[PDB]
Design a binder for this molecule. Sequence first.
Ligand SMILES: [Cu+2]
Length: 284
Amino acid sequence: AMKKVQGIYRAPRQHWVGDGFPVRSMFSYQSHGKQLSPFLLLDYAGPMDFTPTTQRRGVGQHPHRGFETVTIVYHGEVEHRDSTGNGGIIGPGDVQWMTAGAGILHEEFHSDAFAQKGGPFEMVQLWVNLPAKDKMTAPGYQAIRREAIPQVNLPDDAGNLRVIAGEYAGNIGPAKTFSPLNVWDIRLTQGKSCEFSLPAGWNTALIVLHGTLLVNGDAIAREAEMVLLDPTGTHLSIEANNDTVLLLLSGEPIDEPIVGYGPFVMNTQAQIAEAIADFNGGRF
Ligand SMILES: [Cu+2]
């Protein structure tokens, strides 16, 4: 049985996060959050050309608690800093997987090298929820180099698939996760198609960044659109009408309440109140 297309959703207008991240919120837990779990949020940054500058564009220090954030860089360079003492530069093809867990402070800025030169900036920021038992896990950070992400050639010269998290055709992705999920970066060649088998009951979304995609033979998704699938079923087909770049997100639902406010995502309102009080009290 196919994972039926539930709907196609166009990106909203762009908004700024800080002065470094012009993003479109392609989905968020406030709408269809149960049908997207474990994924809470996806902000698509760019694509935008930045001017050479002496300024350090980015987003200043702020807290998170209760979930993980994933940065997938396509163009440009970001420098990461967080309160566990982790740092580093994420460039094209690199990924960072940050666990906020019990609580973290972080900031993200254009790298000095990217500041000096300018050019295209394109990135996806993904929030991944944690199961309740793991929400106060210790904060941590995975820097994932492009070279560590398997690139799998699709059959029939159809393109390639980068396994960031999860497993495709026996290729395991380097990102460690708290619940079972896939994050696949797919380049599908115009006129080519591919069939995917996904676990039964997993929530699944396709995020089209570039190109035009025919899904299940009957739904068309274009640049900066989200295809939300029905979790029931196991089979999905995609066909590229033009060379397409997409993210496939799929995961076992976390069947626990979502209570989110600002930078915090917990299971209850009292836990949100505790996060605000801890942050205000200097505990982060
Ligand atoms: Cu943040």
